[PDB]
């Protein structure tokens, strides 16, 4: 088959695995770029949050895909999604997804284990595909074929005041600057 195609940055270049990028939104006045914050009861670990001040680019972070080799990032592509820099936690940056029992939703928080790809790590690995001419995060790992993931597109869930990213209806549409 064909590979399907490079997601490219705001400059247009191929983003590539092992550098940091920041994921802005398209649609302006809402908030900026993502970023870590203690949303919840306990500090760690940290949830994915889309900045609130739109000036913010907010944290760097880089893709790592399923086959440990390929050095492109791609649509329809399973990656590990991690921020670059240390936190107040010792978990890890590494985004999992994670279902909520109190209100339903399925939120992207940290913590993750890298690679090992297959049911043990599931929840670790999300997409990226095309959305008009920008993109959209998305849930649906293909790592274990005898799994039944509940797949979606990640949009912006209002959680304890913070804008959450999560299962959606409304995809949260996305760019990616080269930090």
Same mark, same amino acid.
């Given at each position: 088959?064909?590979?399907?195609?490079?997601? =490219?940055?705001?400059?247009?270049?191929? %983003?590539?695995?092992?550098?940091?990028?920041?994921? =802005?939104?398209?649609?302006?006045?809402?908030?900026?770029? %993502?970023?870590?914050?203690?949303?919840?009861?306990?500090?760690?670990? %940290?949830?994915?949050?889309?900045?609130?001040?739109?000036?913010?680019?907010?944290?760097? %972070?880089?893709?790592?895909?399923?086959?440990?080799?390929?050095?492109?990032?791609?649509?329809?592509?399973?990656?590990?999604?991690?921020?670059?820099?240390?936190?107040?936690?010792?978990?890890?940056?590494?985004?999992? =997804?994670?279902?909520?029992?109190?209100?339903g939703q399925r939120f992207v928080t940290t913590g993750g284990v890298e690679g090992n790809p297959g049911r043990e790590t599931l929840d670790n690995w999300f997409k990226i595909e095309k959305y008009e001419d920008d993109y959209k995060l998305v849930f649906c790992p293909t790592v274990c074929d005898f799994c039944k993931p509940v797949c979606g597109d990640i949009g912006i869930y209002i959680q304890n005041g913070y804008r959450r990213l999560a299962l959606s209806d409304v995809p949260f549409k996305v760019m990616f600057k080269k930090a």
């Open positions: 088959e064909s590979a399907p195609d490079p997601v =490219l940055d705001t400059e247009g270049k191929q %983003l590539r695995s092992g550098v940091d990028y920041y994921i =802005l939104p398209v649609i302006r006045g809402r908030g900026g770029g %993502l970023t870590l914050a203690s949303t919840g009861n306990e500090n760690c670990p %940290l949830d994915v949050v889309q900045e609130q001040h739109e000036v913010s680019n907010g944290l760097p %972070l880089t893709f790592t895909p399923v086959n440990p080799k390929k050095g492109v990032i791609r649509v329809s592509t399973d990656h590990n999604i991690k921020f670059s820099a240390s936190t107040i936690c010792v978990q890890s940056t590494l985004w999992k =997804l994670e279902y909520d029992e109190s209100s």
